């Protein structure tokens, strides 16, 4: 059950979500980014170190945007058959956390764009304006983000998040 701290940690973002790791730290999928902007949360491009690789996007800041978060550790994905948890915010304000059998890290072909993914199946279903949503596993008694939400099969029994590499 992920405590409220960590789910507001969940920002509307683009056209779907991103992800607070840290004070410092934001993580979304590339293609839920708005182009052609010059300030993120108030920053200026200029002020944030910005990488994006295989669908997955990372935003460092210069400075503390959410002090009252401690940081968690990010993971380039998660053991294989590992149940993680995708933390969906809805815009109605519902939240709607989804357990998933995690398969193998894979890089894939998405409608063009290349991803360092991971596969899961659902164990309720993702929808357009889910990605970037984290993915998160328990690990001791610490939390632990492992990629944010990419794709989904047809099906939909199978959803993709991004990894960093």
């Known amino acids: 059950h992920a405590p409220p701290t960590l789910w507001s940690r969940v920002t509307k973002f683009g056209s779907g979500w991103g992800f607070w790791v840290s004070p410092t730290v ?71 956390p989804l357990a998933v059998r995690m398969g193998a890290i894979a890089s894939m072909r998405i409608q063009g764009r290349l991803v360092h993914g991971q596969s899961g ?14 993915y998160v596993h328990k690990r001791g008694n610490d939390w632990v983000v492992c990629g944010v939400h990419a794709a989904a099969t047809k099906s939909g029994n199978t959803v993709v998040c991004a990894v960093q590499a």
């Open 26 to 96: 934001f993580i979304t999928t590339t293609h839920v980014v708005p182009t052609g902007v010059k300030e993120f949360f108030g920053e200026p491009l200029s002020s944030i170190a910005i990488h994006q690789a295989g669908e997955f996007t990372q935003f460092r800041f210069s400075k503390k945007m959410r002090p009252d978060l401690t940081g968690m550790v990010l993971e380039e994905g998660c053991p294989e058959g590992t149940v993680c948890s995708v933390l969906i915010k809805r815009d109605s304000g519902e939240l709607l």
């Open 121 to 134: 199946m659902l164990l309720l279903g993702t929808i357009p304006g889910d990605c970037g949503a984290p």
